Amino acid sequence: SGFRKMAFPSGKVEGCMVQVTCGTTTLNGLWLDDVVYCPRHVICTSEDMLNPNYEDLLIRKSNHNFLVQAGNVQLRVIGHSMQNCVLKLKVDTANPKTPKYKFVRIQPGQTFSVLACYNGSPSGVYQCAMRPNFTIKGSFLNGSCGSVGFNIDYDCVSFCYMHHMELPTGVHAGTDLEGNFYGPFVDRQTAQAAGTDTTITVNVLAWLYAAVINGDRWFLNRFTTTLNDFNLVAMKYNYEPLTQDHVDILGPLSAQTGIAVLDMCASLKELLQNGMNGRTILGSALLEDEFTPFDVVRQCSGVT
Amino acid sequence: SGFRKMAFPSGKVEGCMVQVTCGTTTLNGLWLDDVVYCPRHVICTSEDMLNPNYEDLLIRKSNHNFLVQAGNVQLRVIGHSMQNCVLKLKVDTANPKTPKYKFVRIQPGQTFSVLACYNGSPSGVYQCAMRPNFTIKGSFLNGSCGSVGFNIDYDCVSFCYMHHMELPTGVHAGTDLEGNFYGPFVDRQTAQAAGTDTTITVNVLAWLYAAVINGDRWFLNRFTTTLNDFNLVAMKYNYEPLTQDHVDILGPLSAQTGIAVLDMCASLKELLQNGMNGRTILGSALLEDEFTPFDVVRQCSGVT
Numbered sequence A, B: 001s002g003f004r005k006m007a008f009p010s011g012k013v014e015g016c017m018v019q020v021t022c023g024t025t026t027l028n029g030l031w032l033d034d035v036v037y038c039p040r041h042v043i044c045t046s047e048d049m050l051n052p053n054y055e056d057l058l059i060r061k062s063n064h065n066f067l068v069q070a071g072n073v074q075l076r077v078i079g080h081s082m083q084n085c086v087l088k089l090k091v092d093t094a095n096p097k098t099p100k101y102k103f104v105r106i107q108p109g110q111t112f113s114v115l116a117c118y119n120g121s122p123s124g125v126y127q128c129a130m131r132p133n134f135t136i137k138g139s140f141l142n143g144s145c146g147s148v149g150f151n152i153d154y155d156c157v158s159f160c161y162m163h164h165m166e167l168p169t170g171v172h173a174g175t176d177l178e179g180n181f182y183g184p185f186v187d188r189q190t191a192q193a194a195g196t197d198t199t200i201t202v203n204v205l206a207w208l209y210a211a212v213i214n215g216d217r218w219f220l221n222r223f224t225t226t227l228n229d230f231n232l233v234a235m236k237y238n239y240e241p242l243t244q245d246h247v248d249i250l251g252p253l254s255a256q257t258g259i260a261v262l263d264m265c266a267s268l269k270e271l272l273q274n275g276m277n278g279r280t281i282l283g284s285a286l287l288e289d290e291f292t293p294f295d296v297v298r299q300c301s302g303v304t
């Protein structure tokens, strides 16, 4: 029992972190097989970041200008190429610590672990969700660029995020491992609008199921609702509309607890309309949306 | 910017996890050098756990009864001994993945990362505090015994906790790596009183400093207080009394923000007496006490 905001064990990812320096700029790179992936803005100076012409800036760079160090070991760069907003530096040595891995583009509302790094050195690991507006609310300081987000399925690391930028609002933006930004963001020092965000309804319901499993039941009521009625309330409170696909994904939790998904929706409707009345759920005084139904099942069954 | 409940990178600890089986019971062990540490209750059956005579149960066990497996590798046990509530199984092979490490007994109110494991396999990592009453509010299911808590200082892992038990209240209890329980707990299936818990005042103030650093400032007011006056409020609200030693540890945060410790205490006094008024601080709707002043500085400066 007990329910915590748990990150995946980061060991397999720590083994891939390297420091990449180009000119005056140092950030983090991900060394998988004989390729090092890093944000393309490693080739910029401060004057370049207003509106960088990345193609022109990269043309002034040669393989020997990219300094890649994996702690002690210096990697020899034998090729470089830009793919979207990432650079791929081919090195002459395959990383001996390369785990089984995939590159995946996660959907908004999905969660992942971030291994925050500085100068190629891991500093901490935390779990977070990709917001519906494609930002993440992380903990990143200057130098954290190139830190990655990931999930693990037994022995396979699915890398889903590489950190690029902090928006003037303090929220974070980055790309998949092919260098495509999540959301409308561009890698420029420019004020950029993040869309209107919403609360991830399916995750809040998954979390209410985790609360019932772990003994927090005070919010359960004698009511039920419909998808239509619940969605009117979700609309008023800036929650994502609930679909049958979300109800379907909650099936295992519904079956385990015996609480029909629409009955949990009526508990969620009452919490939205009434608040928590100074009480808590799993140590939180607000409705938590950073646990997916999969995260709840995984944690409640002890998956390794 | 951004502030998250961050755990240490778990890689160095994942390399030490093993599975230990004795009879019908399997739990986790920590393999450091040529010794495997695990909870002594690995030698019990369900009938034994009401009031185990550990000395007698261990006398029926030989080195060959302790099955230690590090994933694929089977360790040969050449010695066994009980120290307090832990067993030390001497093995014939030093763990090649043994990091630089120390065994430390942490103080109540200090924080650490837990690597939750099942059958010797890491499942997740989360940060938590040792409550003032020596319990931890973790996420542990049956089979998680032997999972450890730790901190890292550059390349040194200080192991501070080994998980043993879940109390009937759903809170968790364990020992230091010498097998001494934190708190009054015994390793028996018996209802056991945890002391009255309090909120870790110094940590809440550290967290209010992290909030000001990261842009959440709404709670700052035009007031100040004294240690005596603040401690009357801390008393009413079951907060730990604040001492000059706590004010001293907050010195760096006070210097960085320019907010005198007693002025932050007046903000904390007003939040205790008035609540949050439906607002949040660093994404929380309650006063967070799981970040020490050291954790706040480390996170706000990007220490690796």
Ligand SMILES: O[C@@H](Cc1cccc(Cl)c1)Cn1cncn1
Pocket: A041, A049, A140, A141, A142, A143, A144, A145, A164, A165, A166, A167, A186, A187, A188, A189, A190, B001
């Ligand atoms: O925002 C980053 C620098 C930068 C500026 C503008 C655009 C880009 Cl792609 C990068 C630094 N940073 C990342 N997390 C916290 N700080």
Ligand SMILES: O[C@@H](Cc1cccc(Cl)c1)Cn1cncn1
Pocket: A001, B041, B049, B140, B141, B142, B143, B144, B145, B164, B165, B166, B167, B186, B187, B188, B189, B190
């Ligand atoms: O409580 C543990 C079993 C047990 C019972 C009684 C005493 C002891 Cl020392 C061990 C199982 N467990 C640990 N975390 C979650 N579940």
